[PDB]
């Protein structure tokens, strides 16, 4: 169908500015002042930030700002936030009712701070044990950057099998959220002393411990 | 803005037709003879498949079909293909600008059997409540095709107030895992009769309910 030409990265720093350009033909990004810009995250429900060459929707202040030149449009997103970590697709009207779009993109917002994790490790519930099954979640919260290496242990010597650790994904605080489950049979749970979760974030271990002799 | 609520996963074997139904909310999304539809592939640029309720674009096949009920706008793909595999989204407008987008739907060509989520809900620990923290986890495991919609309750009244959820990651056994949390104060917890976690997949919806207990 033939697509509009953009840059694939538009890196700024936390409160700088960024120009994303989107370029077409005299038939599209040049013929009509009907160019739109769209903000989309990581699998998420996908917002429109500016609608009719330059004009903004219902709340997006006057920091999401856009312009056309001739054959080129440009989105000059001012004073970088952290939230804005997103894929910014452009569009424009072709004629004869159909609409033409921009290439596969991403803005990297640089110099955001580093969070070392909140590791929350749970018991198996009094629903689960009653079901004759046992599973323990190691929740790995609000961390940046999106690299963690999870490992588990039984009394002190590793568990590799039982374990199933999820990948990194954004919290909409725009840090990261990830998990890991170790699935037991309640005989295998009630036998022991310690059952620990050991997580490696940026050259530091965060080990939490959980045990039997409780009310459950 | 916000609300247009479609299916999480819409699955189908190659041949076997699929319909994607998108329901709306009480004002705007009624006496509205618009609603367009989009497809978004791997990394690539989004494409317009249906425009204004039922019409199509130029390079679009005889395969695709959008319609009216009242609240719900369908999209019946007839003749399913590997080419057709993608995320898909339904649109609209209000204000002039104030244009609402769908919650998203995977279209999957089944290459593995269908599984419906083993949805385990945990309370916060004896210890975590010693720590003055309160967080619950809804662990959603062992599912295929790999798009789940999640939803939390506080005394049956639906939260969108403390909730972070993860993108669905493929396990050791070729099926999937996700995880949702709710964070509160140890009093925000204690203050209620019950909390719950509800998960929409294909045919399925599945709740699971925890009540605050003292362990004292």
């Amino acid at each position: 169908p033939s697509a509009l030409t953009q840059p694939p990265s538009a890196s700024g720093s936390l409160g700088q500015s960024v120009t994303i350009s989107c370029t077409g033909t005299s038939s599209d990004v040049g013929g009509y002042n009907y160019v739109s810009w769209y903000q989309q995250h990581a699998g998420k429900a996908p917002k429109v930030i500016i609608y009719e060459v330059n004009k903004r929707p219902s709340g997006v202040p006057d920091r999401f700002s856009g312009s056309k030149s001739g054959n080129t449009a440009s989105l000059t997103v001012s004073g970088l936030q952290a939230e804005d970590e997103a894929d910014y697709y452009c569009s424009s009207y072709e004629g004869s009712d159909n609409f033409v779009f921009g290439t596969g993109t991403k803005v990297t917002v640089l110099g955001q701070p580093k969070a070392n994790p909140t590791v929350t490790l749970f018991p198996p519930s009094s629903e689960e044990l009653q079901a004759n099954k046992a599973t323990l979640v190691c929740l790995i919260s609000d961390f940046y950057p999106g690299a963690v290496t999870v490992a588990w242990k039984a009394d002190g010597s590793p568990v590799k099998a039982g374990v199933e650790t999820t990948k990194p994904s954004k919290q909409s605080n725009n840090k990261y959220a990830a998990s890991s489950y170790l699935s037991l049979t309640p005989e295998q749970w009630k036998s022991h002393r310690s059952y620990s979760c050991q997580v490696t974030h940026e050259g530091s271990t965060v080990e939490k411990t959980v045990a039997p002799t409780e009310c459950s | 803005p916000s609300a247009l609520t479609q299916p999480p996963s819409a699955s189908g074997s190659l041949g076997q037709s699929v319909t994607i139904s998108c329901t709306g909310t009480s004002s705007d999304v009624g006496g509205y003879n618009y609603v367009s539809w989009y497809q978004q592939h791997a990394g690539k640029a989004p494409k317009v498949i249906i425009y204004e309720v039922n019409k199509r674009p130029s390079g679009v096949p005889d395969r695709f079909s959008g319609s009216k009920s009242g609240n719900t706008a369908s999209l019946t793909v007839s003749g399913l293909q590997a080419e057709d595999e993608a995320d898909y989204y339904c649109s609209s407008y209000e204000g002039s600008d104030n244009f609402v987008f769908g919650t998203g739907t995977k279209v999957t060509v089944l290459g593995q059997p269908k599984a419906n989520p083993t949805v385990t809900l945990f309370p916060p620990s004896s210890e975590e409540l010693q720590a003055n923290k309160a967080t619950l986890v809804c662990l959603i495991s062992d599912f295929y095709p790999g798009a789940v919609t999640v939803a939390w309750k506080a005394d049956g009244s639906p939260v969108k107030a403390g909730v972070e959820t993860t993108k669905p990651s493929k396990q050791s056994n070729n099926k999937y895992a996700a995880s949702s949390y709710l964070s509160l104060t140890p009093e925000q917890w204690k203050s209620h009769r019950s909390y719950s976690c509800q998960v929409t997949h294909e045919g399925s919806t599945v709740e699971k309910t925890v009540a605050p207990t003292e362990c004292s």
Partner: peptide
């Protein structure tokens, strides 16, 4: 989402 009938 768009522009317009146009």
């Amino acid at each position: 989402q768009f522009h317009p009938x146009x």
